[PDB]
Specification:
- The structure is cut from a larger assembly and holds nine protein chains of nine kinds.
- By secondary structure, chain A is of the alpha+beta class.
- Chain A has helices spanning 15-18, 30-36, and strands at 40-41, 46-49, 61-64, 72-73, 80-82.
- Chain A has one domain (1-83).
- Chain A is built from two helices and five strands.
- In chain A, the strands form two sheets. A three-stranded mixed beta sheet of chain A has the order 1-5-4, with no helix packed on it. In chain A, strands 2-3 form a two-stranded antiparallel sheet.
- Chain E has one helix at 5-15; one strand at 66-68.
- Chain E is flat.
- In chain E, 12% of the residues lie in helices and 3% in strands.
- Chain H is mainly alpha-helical.
- Chain H has one domain.
- In chain H, helix 1 (11-35) runs antiparallel to helix 2 (42-55) and helix 1 (11-35) packs parallel to helix 3 (62-80).
- The chains are: A alpha+beta, B alpha+beta, C alpha+beta, D mainly alpha, E little secondary structure, F alpha+beta, G alpha+beta, H mainly alpha, I alpha+beta.
- Chain C binds chain H through residues 104-106, 131, 138-140, 144-146, 167, 169-170, 172-177, and chain H through 3-4, 6, 63-64, 67, 70, 74-75, 77-78, 83-92, 95-97.
- The structure holds ubiquinone-1, iron/sulfur cluster (SF4) (3 copies), FE2/S2 (inorganic) cluster (FES) and zinc ion.
- FE2/S2 (inorganic) cluster binds next to loops of chain G.
- Chain F: Keywords: Electron transport, Membrane, Mitochondrion, Mitochondrion inner membrane, Phosphoprotein, Respiratory chain, Transit peptide, Transport.
- Chain F: Its main location: mitochondrion.
- Chain F: It is a peripheral membrane protein.
Chain lengths: 83, 178, 198, 112, 95, 118, 263, 114, 385
Amino acid sequence: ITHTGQVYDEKDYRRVRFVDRQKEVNENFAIDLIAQQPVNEVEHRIIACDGGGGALGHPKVYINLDKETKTGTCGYCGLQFKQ
Amino acid sequence: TYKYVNKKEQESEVDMKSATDNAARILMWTELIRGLGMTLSYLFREPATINYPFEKGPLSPRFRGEHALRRYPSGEERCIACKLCEAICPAQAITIEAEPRADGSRRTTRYDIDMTKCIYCGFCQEACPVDAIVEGPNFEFSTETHEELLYNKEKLLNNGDKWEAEIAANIQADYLYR
Amino acid sequence: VRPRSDVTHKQLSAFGEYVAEILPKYVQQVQVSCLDELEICIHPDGVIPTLTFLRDHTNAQFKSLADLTAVDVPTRQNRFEIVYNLLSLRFNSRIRVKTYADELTPIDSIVSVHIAANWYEREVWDMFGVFFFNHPDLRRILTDYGFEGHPFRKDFPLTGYVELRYDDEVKRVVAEPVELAQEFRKFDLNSPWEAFPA
Amino acid sequence: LKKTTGLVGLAVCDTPHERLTILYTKTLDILKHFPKHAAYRKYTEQITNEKLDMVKAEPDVKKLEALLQGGEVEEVILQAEKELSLARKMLKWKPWEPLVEEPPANQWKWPI
Amino acid sequence: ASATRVIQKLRNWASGQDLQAKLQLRYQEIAKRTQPPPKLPVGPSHKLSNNYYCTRDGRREVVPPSIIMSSQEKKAVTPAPPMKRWELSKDQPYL
Amino acid sequence: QLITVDEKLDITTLTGVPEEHIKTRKVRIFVPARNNMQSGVNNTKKWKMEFDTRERWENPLMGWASTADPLSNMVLTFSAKEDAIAFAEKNGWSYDVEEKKVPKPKSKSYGANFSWNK
Amino acid sequence: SNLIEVFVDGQSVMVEPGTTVLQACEKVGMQIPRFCYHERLSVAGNCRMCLVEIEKAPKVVAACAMPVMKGWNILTNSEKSKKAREGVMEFLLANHPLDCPICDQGGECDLQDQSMMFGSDRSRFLEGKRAVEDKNIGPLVKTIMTRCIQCTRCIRFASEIAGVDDLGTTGRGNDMQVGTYIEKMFMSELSGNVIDICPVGALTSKPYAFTARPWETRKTESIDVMDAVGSNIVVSTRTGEVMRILPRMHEDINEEWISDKTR
Amino acid sequence: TSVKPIFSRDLNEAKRRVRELYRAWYREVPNTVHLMQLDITVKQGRDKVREMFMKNAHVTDPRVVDLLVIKGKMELQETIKVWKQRTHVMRFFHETETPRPKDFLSKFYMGHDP
Amino acid sequence: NMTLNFGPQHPAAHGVLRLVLELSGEMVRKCDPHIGLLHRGTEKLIEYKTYLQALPYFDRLDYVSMMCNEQAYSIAVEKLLNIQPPPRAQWIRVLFGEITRILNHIMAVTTHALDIGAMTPFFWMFEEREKMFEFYERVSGARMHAAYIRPGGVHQDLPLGLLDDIYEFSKNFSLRIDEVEEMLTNNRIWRNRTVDIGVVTAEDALNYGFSGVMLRGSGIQWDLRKTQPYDVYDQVEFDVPIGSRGDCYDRYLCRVEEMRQSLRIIEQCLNKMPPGEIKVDDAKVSPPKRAEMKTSMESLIHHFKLYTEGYQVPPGATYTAIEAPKGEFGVYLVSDGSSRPYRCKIKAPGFAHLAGLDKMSKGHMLADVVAIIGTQDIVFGEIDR
Ligand SMILES: COC1=C(OC)C(=O)C(CC=C(C)C)=C(C)C1=O
Ligand code: SF4
Ligand code: SF4
Ligand code: SF4
Ligand code: FES
Ligand SMILES: [Zn+2]
């Protein structure tokens, strides 16, 4: 159910906690939300993902998009870029 | 440089006029009447209270208030589990355990801020490199049961989604300062 | 880098020698920190004598006791390091006289020299367990009435061994051995690399 | 002459020069028993002798207050007899003696 | 504020002070919110040259305490120069 | 005048420790090794004595680790082996000292790597 | 006999002829900041982060590689030997990708600490950085090699401690990348030690990728039971489940290394 | 060896003091059980006093004994000069806590670490 | 003597106080204050916490003078690191330090009256106090318990509207002191309740270690702000309000004057605050700026290490005393080379003052004791620590 497949077993009693209450979960899951964003087709071997917004984003990092097969993915945003 | 408070510079010798003035002060409670005038004066001043539900006491952007975990505009949660928010928390409130997500990305399997343990220092706001954990503006989260106060990743992420618009405005206003 | 005046490190240094000379029977070491603070160190027997000389000497009047504390170096044979910080409103200088006391080798009390110490000495007994002879009324000040163990000792667990909850059956608050729901995470923080010769 | 000293409890002492000369001369006397080369005797005798000499020399108390500091003259009186009391106490204490006992080794090593 | 003059006059009198001049309630005098964006100044040490840390790190150039009188004619010396008497204030010596 | 006592300072009676944690707790005096990750040796200098590890059951409501042993997180640091042994004896905890093991001297010289026949 | 006397800041230590300058500092107790020098790996001199200043000498010398000579005074903390570190650390950091909150050698970095202790507080590299394509060297070691400080301890271990002789340097200039030229996995026992021996977090362990962070890990010293050499090991446990087993040094049994199986 | 005496020169003199404290507590137990309205029996309490006074019967060193009574005296003062209310006193009886068995088989059946 | 305890719940007991009183009739012959009801273990917890993560603890020792408390730890740690805060930061600490003494004195004068029975002074000033917290909240984000004054420098620059708003508060505040001035300074009822009560003689005050308004009230002239000028207290001009006789009135009058003198110091700080940086520029001691840590590797390494491990202050020990509103607040911080402290003895102006209650409240009624605690400005957080 949750982001990590956290689902109390059919016999676990913490399910009593959810009795007469809502088990809080978020419909918007990141694993999926990042996928939607398309691969950025940059034209330089190495590009940088400042995180969007500079100081309001994530530490700046340079990605090597040299591997033709795969696409570079910022360890921070998850945004992907291909040459 | 010093200053004597309550030190009588000299012994003014009683002069009838002086004595009368004093005796009148004791007999007709003159100074006591002075005090009554002050309170009557305010009775006429506008009261400073605010209708609490209808009007709210002003809080500027840095107000720490209630914890929230932000997400990138794309929808990828900002936290990358570096876990130094856990390291610098003074109260040991934040508990983080992580594992590489299927995507291969780094993410936190469990992020639990114990708000009863938290003393709202705002260092976590400070420490985060991606600034995923922020001190959100809301201060009204009083709860009937102690368990509700303990917050897991889903409550904080949900708290983040609800208040993201104001959190973004608040961080927008104060980031130059930081 | 902080501004440092060597006027003080010289003045205080000299005074140190003066005290030492006047009280050689007890002064073991007298040092001035790089922070311009003097710290005469005295044999425990010199507690009464060294303080009194500082409280009542024309060339060194140290009228008020800023603090009485006891660091605990477990390695050190004499575990506690009673430290007395004093102030001289006349000469605008502070000095610290520090002695060493083991757990069952009591120190004299200075309540006579400064009555400020009446409370701090009770505080040192309650937290560290050092005992002060000739104290008017030594008894726990900060800890609970029935507390067992001296808390600030480095060998005492932070969480302690007992915690309190209300039990209906007995309708009264009741100690139980501590059971914590998230143990204190003991982050190891020391880095394996030194900083300077010091 | 003055009405009162700043300090609450202290009270104006008339004949202050005489009161000081009495206390100062006494201390000098007590110190006379201290061992000859005793550090306290040489140091305090020097301080007390200078204080008297000034008290003898100055007939105006206000200037006397400036010459040996002491703030108000009444305080200097309290400091002198406090010292007189300690001088008597140290003779009993015999602190001029050598160190009572060397510190256990590594007792004063802070990095630990 | 927003008080009929008479109430103000009664107020000022009963209090004995022109309380109107210094009202406690704040009205359009307080700094407006959303004050302009701040570009704060970068301090020293941001030079790109002659900025060697070894020349600006008082943290550990500090040394172990200096030791005097370790166990392992001469004039009297005080802890420090006797203190200087404070002087009565001149704007308001008394009261 | 001083009095004579041959009794090993045992002060177990004054320390104020519950009986269970003085007779069932074994502490080990050891000099910490170096996580191989880093090559710094400033954490392999002072001896430390650490009490034996105890139960760490999962908490049902939040899954946080929970411990019933008070002396768990306590690690006292002692400069020398002799002093640490003394602490165990007077406090009455059992001890099992481990000798320090320091890297043996190793002979190195850049020339060797260019040896005619190695 | 065979005991030269060299002074480390005037401490007259005496060392067998042959001891390096770094080794001379060790016996006094001082520790030269070092990268690319491992006790049980050949001296290479790649980093030059250990430059010290023997007294009365024009240039600073390489500690780990300079045979000490009679009389020399090391001046390890000399203003010069600090510029010789404040300026090297400038370089290692310049091409470094700042993903320290990704680098799981976060608190286990001999490059942040040697930077927080022996280096400067800022940066002047206003220019751009470099990036090196990663490599799938194996299923145990995750080589995020854009982290590599070209210290060649891997290429040594992979040749000297283990006889793999596969890892090697490829190219020259600032795009010397120390990865297998063709993608052949580094399959050998003794493989996981590369993790422990790379001070940078370029190549680290893939199973223990992001499960923890070292300050939290409580470290209990125990014995290897998988094999009969009985190698000493340290089991790093967090909140009660083992997170990592890494070697702890036993001169006689496992001298800083452990098998791929027992970690 | 070569220790300085705290208050008692030898176990003999020290024991004198213990006797006094025992008496003190013995004479006090009844009063407390009444001024605190404790639900215990004077006899029962007096045995507890004995328990404690013997829990530390093994101490052989004079200095340790002397501190023990100093501390003991302090406790009495907190219970006769009443600053310690029932909750504090009853704690001595460990009334609420469940007793743990010391039998090996018992522990085996219950706890990982005995 | 009819032993009666001033139990905690009672309002005059500051929430936690069990004064065992021996009532010789209504006259009280002995007090044995039983503190310890709020001992939190503040100084054993600090040993397990790094220097930055222990700052917060210092805002909770005296909880009515938060920033002045955290200026004593900040000065100590700074001494042990031989680093000094930048010029703007030192003025900001003096600006916030006097806002805190106005805040503590409004607390002490108005709550004393609440105990005696005057209720209106508290309400008028408490509205003036939330005006002030706002200044804390607008600069740190917390109404109280800010954590703004950091071991090296202060944490963030003042927002661009704060100094104008501090001028408007300081401009009109003095009338507010003047107003309780009229309502509680000449009332025969106050004077009778306060004058000639708890007189403490000058030498007795020094001997009991009073060190505060209690020291100054009896005429001893000691202010750590002028004698041993910490921060910039050497570049601001003020008059210490020394009282003459020592009754609880002279001590009140002194506290009202210090509020007025602090407005004089606040004025100077707004008039002369320098352009500059708010935290020392050594990344080793003060954390790197948000933009720098996200663009420069040396800054991320310094941010990571500082937040996760710590400053690692050089081994040493220092006793640093600053004039906290209550009195001399000092931290004896003993430091090993480690990033976390070894000992932190918080000297609390208050442990000494409460000891004096038995001597000061001599030959006094049950009602006088309520005034005696009120005139010591005792907050049990500092005493209990
Ligand atoms: C200002 O000093 C203090 C008080 O007295 C006026 C208290 O009432 C209290 C508690 C009072 C209540 C019942 C809110 C505290 C904590 C205090 O600090
Ligand atoms: S710091 Fe920010 S990012 Fe790193 S873990 Fe805590 S929250 Fe997630
Ligand atoms: S290696 Fe990993 S941790 Fe060490 S600096 Fe480079 S990135 Fe930060
Ligand atoms: S991989 Fe690790 S070891 Fe091999 S070179 Fe790059 S850094 Fe040095
Ligand atoms: S260690 Fe000296 S060259 Fe790398
Ligand atoms: Zn990105």
